[PDB]
Design a protein around this ligand. Sequence first.
Ligand SMILES: [Zn+2]
Length: 252
Amino acid sequence: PQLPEVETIRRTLLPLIVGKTIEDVRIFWPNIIRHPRDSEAFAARMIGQTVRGLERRGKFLKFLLDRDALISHLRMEGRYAVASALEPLEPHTHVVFCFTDGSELRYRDVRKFGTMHVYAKEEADRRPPLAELGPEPLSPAFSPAVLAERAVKTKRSVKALLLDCTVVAGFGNIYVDESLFRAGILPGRPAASLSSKEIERLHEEMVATIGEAVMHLYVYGRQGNPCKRCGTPIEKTVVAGRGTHYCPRCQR
DNA sequence: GGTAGACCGGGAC
DNA sequence: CCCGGTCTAC
Ligand SMILES: [Zn+2]
């Protein structure tokens, strides 16, 4: 799920779990548990705690309990569902939180690629994976100024810059390519080569792209197809180690 | 500062 | 073997 999808999950999941008390935690793929390192300690500490809230940072979900916070990343295919303990689990279910009311919060993932960390609430923000995470792209904390500061300091491509979680929180490959197209900037451009004008334009399109989604693609996955703005075939290459889609006419 | 390795497996070769 | 995100290793 991309950032906007994670925000939707946050919004819809909260009322389904708030006020419920954990009676058990079942783990079928321990590797998902990253902290505590021992999945048995992870399970034990959550028992008896009530869900008090649910927040999002980047693509991370932060479940707020009595004493602890559970930090969860779904990666690309992870999913949460709330359902009865009486019904069979869906395929690829790796972690289940059982509540005292007979309902469960279940985590699935065919790719088995997601992560979970639990810390005392007061510690969560200074520990992995939230430590060092950049500002929310929709927050004033993410400004053209902040972006310009990071761009000049580096010799990396602009795409590499935007993919950096310390620069801005949870901006995925898709939204990076879409934003750069909308800003008219080639993804391979050195970040330091961007003018002040281009930086402002880029920040503006980043906010608009992610903002609209939170509330159809120009380039992502459209290689070989005509650009929707100029009709030039969209091309795909590799930049910053990712599939990279762009219009060679619209972007400079 | 920066990269590479690490984790995964459905679908492509 | 590739690919996505984000971490530890170096
Ligand atoms: Zn174009």
